[PDB]
Amino acid sequence: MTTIAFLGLGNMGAPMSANLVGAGHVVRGFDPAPTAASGAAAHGVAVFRSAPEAVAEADVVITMLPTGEVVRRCYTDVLAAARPATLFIDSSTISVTDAREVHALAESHGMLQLDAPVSGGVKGAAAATLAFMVGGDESTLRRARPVLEPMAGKIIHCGAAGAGQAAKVCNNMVLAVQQIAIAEAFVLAEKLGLSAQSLFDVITGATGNCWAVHTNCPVPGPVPTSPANNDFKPGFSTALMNKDLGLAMDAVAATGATAPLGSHAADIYAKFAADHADLDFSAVIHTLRA
Amino acid sequence: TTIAFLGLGNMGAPMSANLVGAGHVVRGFDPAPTAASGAAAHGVAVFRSAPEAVAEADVVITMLPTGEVVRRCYTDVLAAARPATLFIDSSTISVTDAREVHALAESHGMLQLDAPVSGGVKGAAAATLAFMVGGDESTLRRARPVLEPMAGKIIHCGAAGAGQAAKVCNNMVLAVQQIAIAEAFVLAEKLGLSAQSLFDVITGATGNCWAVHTNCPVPGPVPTSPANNDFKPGFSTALMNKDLGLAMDAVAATGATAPLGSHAADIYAKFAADHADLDFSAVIHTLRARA
Numbered sequence: 064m065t066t067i068a069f070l071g072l073g074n075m076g077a078p079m080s081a082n083l084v085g086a087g088h089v090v091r092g093f094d095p096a097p098t099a100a101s102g103a104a105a106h107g108v109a110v111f112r113s114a115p116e117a118v119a120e121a122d123v124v125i126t127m128l129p130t131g132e133v134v135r136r137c138y139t140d141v142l143a144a145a146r147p148a149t150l151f152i153d154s155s156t157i158s159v160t161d162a163r164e165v166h167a168l169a170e171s172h173g174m175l176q177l178d179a180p181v182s183g184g185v186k187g188a189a190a191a192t193l194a195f196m197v198g199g200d201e202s203t204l205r206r207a208r209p210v211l212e213p214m215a216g217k218i219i220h221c222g223a224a225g226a227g228q229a230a231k232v233c234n235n236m237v238l239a240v241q242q243i244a245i246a247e248a249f250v251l252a253e254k255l256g257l258s259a260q261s262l263f264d265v266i267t268g269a270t271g272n273c274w275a276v277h278t279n280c281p282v283p284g285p286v287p288t289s290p291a292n293n294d295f296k297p298g299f300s301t302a303l304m305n306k307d308l309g310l311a312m313d314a315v316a317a318t319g320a321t322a323p324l325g326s327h328a329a330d331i332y333a334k335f336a337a338d339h340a341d342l343d344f345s346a347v348i349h350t351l352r353a
Numbered sequence: 354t355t356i357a358f359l360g361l362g363n364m365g366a367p368m369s370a371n372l373v374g375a376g377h378v379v380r381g382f383d384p385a386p387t388a389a390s391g392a393a394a395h396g397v398a399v400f401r402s403a404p405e406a407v408a409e410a411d412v413v414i415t416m417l418p419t420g421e422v423v424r425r426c427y428t429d430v431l432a433a434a435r436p437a438t439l440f441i442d443s444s445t446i447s448v449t450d451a452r453e454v455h456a457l458a459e460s461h462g463m464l465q466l467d468a469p470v471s472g473g474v475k476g477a478a479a480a481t482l483a484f485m486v487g488g489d490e491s492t493l494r495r496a497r498p499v500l501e502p503m504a505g506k507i508i509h510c511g512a513a514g515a516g517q518a519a520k521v522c523n524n525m526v527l528a529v530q531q532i533a534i535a536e537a538f539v540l541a542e543k544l545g546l547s548a549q550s551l552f553d554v555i556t557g558a559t560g561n562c563w564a565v566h567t568n569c570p571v572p573g574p575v576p577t578s579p580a581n582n583d584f585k586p587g588f589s590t591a592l593m594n595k596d597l598g599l600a601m602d603a604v605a606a607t608g609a610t611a612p613l614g615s616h617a618a619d620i621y622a623k624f625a626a627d628h629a630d631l632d633f634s635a636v637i638h639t640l641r642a643r644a
């Protein structure tokens with residue numbers, strides 16, 4: 064039982080914080096959107112007037128914020144407010160470059176810091192089945208584990224600061240490429256006269272099998288739980304995939320890496336996001352049918 | 354069951370030796386003497402022309418390099434075959450070619466399947482090939498006792514051409530995944546994320562696929578992957594390039610939109626100009642050619 068400041072109580076933060084309260088932690092919340100703050104208070108978060116106040120008497124500070132810029136600003140606002148050697152955990156999804164900058168800033172203030180971005184979305188968040196991909200020192204992670212367990216299905220140490228962000232962004236780039244490639248196969252099958260069911264049974268039993276087909280099948284019928292069967296309601300929204308791909312492209316640009324299919328997929332998803340940011344990212348299949 | 358086996362090359366030779374090993378009478382033809390004589394050494398009765406091999410056959414299997422050769426083989430032998438001979442084409446050819454040769458054979462009162470295969474020479478030798486089959490279910494049922502001794506898996510895909518379509522769609526995806534995995538490993542390295550950590554994450558997350566869990570293109574995480582043995586195939590760039598050409602023919606013939614598969618095909622056509630003999634996962638080292 065530790066005291067945790069939780070900054071950012073939106074679609075991910077609210078359920079995350081609720082599980083922390085359920086596990087017996089004292090949770091001190093801040094979010095400048097009062098609706099978010101109010102919903103969090105209903106589940107037992109003690110809500111404060113400012114982020115400096117929420118942080119003041121905390122052993123651990125979790126951030127679950129929309130961008131690198133917001134995390135940077137938040138750190139600048141609160142780090143001096145925190146007690147020395149408080150443990151900061153950023154579970155936001157932000158660029159590797161931003162992650163390393165904020166990490167260095169936290170340490171220069173005498174604070175411990177990890178990046179621990181997550182996968183699982185809101186459903187995973189509410190069920191406490193999120194995967195945390197953690198960058199930082201192993202000993203810091205050991206100190207953090209009791210805080211992360213109540214929110215987590217999996218905790219994976221990926222390397223030094225920034226490696227949680229790196230591993231996530233690498234996986235999600237691959238996933239985007241796979242989701243388009245699956246969609247392309249299914250439309251080509253359709254034009255060849257190969258049924259959706261038959262293609263599904265082949266690919267899933269063969270070398271092409273992957274989550275994008277076996278769980279996220281972009282045509283209705285073979286996997287009745289996939290978004291194609293429910294008007295492409297997310298699931299994992301195109302807006303979010305497009306955000307993660309922007310971060311992957313930031314990583315490519317910062318490294319001079321060559322990612323021809325990854326950047327092609329980023330370009331496809333940025334166009335699809337303009338009009339279909341609200342549909343599950345499997346809905347990119349629409350762009351392949353005339 | 355007497356079986357005429359036309360095409361006794363890298364795949365045909367071991368497949369035909371498995372048929373002999375299962376008690377079939379196997380008659381053979383290949384215009385390369387070394388292929389033929391090698392096949393005669395494991396029990397195939399080799400003939401001087403394909404029409405000769407076919408004469409006494411209940412089943413005719415073709416394992417040939419292109420659709421045009423399969424088509425010409427068919428028009429050379431169909432009049433030599435007995436009625437209701439079962440023709441199985443296990444070549445990898447276009448869906449269009451598959452369907453035309455199927456119509457040709459059935460017009461002569463024959464029964465015909467397309468049954469291309471996955472698994473390479475190793476799989477052919479070990480009798481673990483995956484047959485992806487198009488045609489009538491009642492014809493596949495008749496074919497089953499022949500396919501079985503060559504096969505680890507037999508999948509009915511649909512009507513004629515569905516075998517070719519299924520295999521070409523899966524291999525297009527495979528190509529895309531192998532490049533995507535390679536991109537991710539290079540990007541991880543530049544970010545200071547170790548190959549082992551990326552491997553541990555992706556294989557336990559949504560990006561997992563055979564391209565990483567079995568064909569990992571960096572040495573270490575999967576000690577048997579080609580990356581740990583100078584990228585010895587495995588599955589050659591030559592062959593992957595061939596399959597992607599067929600995917601591209603199918604995309605062109607249908608007016609399909611396949612941007613990443615088409616991109617993949619370009620990358621592999623280019624890589625095959627230099628590294629045809631390497632495992633297709635070696636594409637990880639040609640990414641800066643496209644820089």
Ligand SMILES: NC(=O)c1ccc[n+]([C@@H]2O[C@H](COP(=O)([O-])OP(=O)(O)OC[C@H]3O[C@@H](n4cnc5c(N)ncnc54)[C@H](O)[C@@H]3O)[C@@H](O)[C@H]2O)c1
Pocket residue numbers: 070071072073074075076093094095096099114127128129130133136137154155156157181182183184185303306
């Ligand atoms: N929603 C998902 O499905 C999902 C899944 C995995 C990861 N993520 C990542 O999680 C992060 C947050 O996601 P979300 O869906 O909860 O976003 P959200 O926009 O729903 O919530 C973010 C919250 O942060 C608050 N906030 C902004 N500035 C603040 C500050 N200085 N102090 C305190 N709070 C502040 C906002 O008012 C808002 O309520 C993002 O980085 C996102 O990419 C989201």
Ligand SMILES: NC(=O)c1ccc[n+]([C@@H]2O[C@H](COP(=O)([O-])OP(=O)(O)OC[C@H]3O[C@@H](n4cnc5c(N)ncnc54)[C@H](O)[C@@H]3O)[C@@H](O)[C@H]2O)c1
Pocket residue numbers: 359360361362363364365382383384385388403416417418419422425426443444445446470471472473474592595
């Ligand atoms: N080698 C592989 O790994 C592999 C794996 C799966 C599928 N395939 C497919 O199998 C087919 C052939 O495979 P392969 O590896 O045996 O190629 P191969 O080129 O080694 O064998 C083809 C053989 O057919 C002979 N031939 C040419 N015309 C002929 C005719 N009219 N009648 C009889 N024989 C003739 C050639 O002399 C040659 O020996 C191709 O369509 C290929 O894509 C190959």
Ligand SMILES: C[C@@H](CCC(=O)O)C(=O)O
Pocket residue numbers: 191192211212213214215216217218
């Ligand atoms: C994920 C965590 C267990 C906690 C949970 O199941 O919520 C762990 O053991 O790593």
Ligand SMILES: C[C@@H](CCC(=O)O)C(=O)O
Pocket residue numbers: 480500501502503504505506507
């Ligand atoms: C078990 C297998 C039959 C092939 C064989 O017997 O080798 C299958 O049914 O696919």
Ligand SMILES: [Mg+2]
Pocket residue numbers: 447448449450602603606
């Ligand atoms: Mg075709």
